């Protein structure tokens, strides 16, 4: 606890999003409150394990990527969609037997 | 168990309280 | 004043002693008035020892702790049969 309480100040920690990966093993990731960075492997999770537009934990010291997390795009879109109307089904609708 | 030991073998009152008045 | 005679406290309230004794004792019946009277010498004395709090804590624990061991009767008598 104290060691991680010693580790985590001199650096901090953040969460990134990979927009691309490099042949040099680096990765294109944004520091989201600020301008973007481009940082390297990160030898546990390889390049092929993750694809661009995915949530990663931006490391705070070498400014590398710590861990892997899921990211959402359509759940914003589909929520804006599902905002408008629900669905129900056949059983919950009637009179359309002609047009169905 | 079945082991060991075991296998070997003023009223209420209604009438009297009402009578105490007319007694004396 | 805790200890007081009944006749001169009835002079302060301006009432007969018969319904002063019965109303004051009725106030003891209501428990709002802490004390008791004395008919023999015509005295009225006030005394109180309010806190029960420790007995409330004790009883609340142990009376339920009965059901506690009743709850342990289920587990510890289940291993037997």
């Amino acid at each position: 606890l104290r060691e991680e309480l010693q580790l985590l100040q001199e650096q901090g920690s953040y969460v990134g999003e990979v927009v691309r990966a490099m042949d040099k093993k680096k990765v294109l990731v944004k520091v989201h409150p600020e301008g973007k960075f481009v940082v390297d492997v990160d030898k546990n999770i390889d390049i092929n394990d993750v694809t661009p537009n995915c949530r990663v934990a931006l490391r705070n010291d070498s400014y590398t990527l710590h861990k892997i997390l899921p990211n959402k795009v359509d759940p914003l879109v589909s929520l804006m969609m599902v905002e408008k109307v629900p669905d129900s089904t056949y059983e919950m609708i009637g009179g359309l037997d002609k047009q169905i | 168990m079945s082991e060991k030991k075991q296998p070997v073998d003023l009223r209420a009152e209604l009438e009297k309280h009402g009578y105490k008045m007319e007694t004396s | 004043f805790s200890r007081v005679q009944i006749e001169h406290i009835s002079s302060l309230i301006k009432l007969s002693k018969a319904d002063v004794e019965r109303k004051l004792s009725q106030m003891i019946l209501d428990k709002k008035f802490h004390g008791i009277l004395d008919q023999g010498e015509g005295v009225l004395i006030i005394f109180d020892e309010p806190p029960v709090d420790k007995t409330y804590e004790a009883a609340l624990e142990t009376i339920q702790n009965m059901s506690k061991v009743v709850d342990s009767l289920y587990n510890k008598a289940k291993k037997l049969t």
């Binding site: - | - | 009277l37 008919q39 007995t55 142990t62």
Partner: protein
Amino acid sequence: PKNPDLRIAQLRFLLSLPEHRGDAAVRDELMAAVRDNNMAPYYEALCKSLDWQIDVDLLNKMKKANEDELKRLDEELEDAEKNLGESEIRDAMMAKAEYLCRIGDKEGALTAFRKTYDKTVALGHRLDIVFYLLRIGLFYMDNDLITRNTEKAKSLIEEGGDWDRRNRLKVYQGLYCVAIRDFKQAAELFLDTVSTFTSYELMDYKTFVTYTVYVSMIALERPDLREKVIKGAEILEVLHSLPAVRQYLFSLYECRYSVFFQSLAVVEQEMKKDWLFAPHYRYYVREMRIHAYSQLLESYRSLTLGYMAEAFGVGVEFIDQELSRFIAAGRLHCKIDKVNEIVETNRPDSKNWQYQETIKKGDLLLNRVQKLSRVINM
């Protein structure tokens, strides 16, 4: 559809406990037997009460004609299910078979209760079912099935809301709390008083008034007692119609002890002849002793028994043996002195009893853990 059979069950109590009624109890039993066409009930009544003479073909042709009324319904269920509707089929066979089970025992009752349990979408019919378990549980004095139907009904009623039938359930649970010994919940749940009005499931309203006014004199405080009866606007008139209990209410507040055992004699005489009140009167009486004597001693710490004997008629040597023998039984323990003319109360018991619950409860507590401690392992 209750009071006719409810009186039959009341007639069972009139036959069972007292052995001195051999005429009126069997008479009106037959008067209620010739109607509603009961079969299994008069069998239990035949063993308890007189065997006649002869019934035989009389009630056998009445059970044969009622079988025709039973077979017209039981052969209409396959003719009714030929068509299709909502409850217009099974609601006829659930209620009338319970009337056909009213002919006897629990069979058609319990089998229709779980039958219609999967059909009715309204709580009113489900609570009517609950009413059927409550009447059939009242006749056989079985408290097992009266808890389950109400526990399942209240969840649907309290989901929820009601006015009339909620007060009806308050009378039910009040009759169950008074069936066993519960002093506080009977009067607390009967606080609705006249808002229940009169119903076939509530039988005689005057008897219900006597039920709540008899049970409100025990666990209810004296200021709360007069707050219920005197301050209550609606309950005051219905308790005023019967001077028997009203005299006991206002004389209990009047503190006069010369009318108490006579008014309690009329109250106890009504307590003896009513069902389910037989086990509970033995404690109810001595409780009224310590109830009336609690306000007798609390007047003065040191009381002169000469002042007590002033108006008693007569309390000189009577309160000596009376109160004493009640002290020896554990009711209103006090230390009273004579020829010094000092009645000393107290007894507060603010020292022993204050700390007694620790060791007392701890005795059986630590005992019950001593069992489980020394049993295992070996």
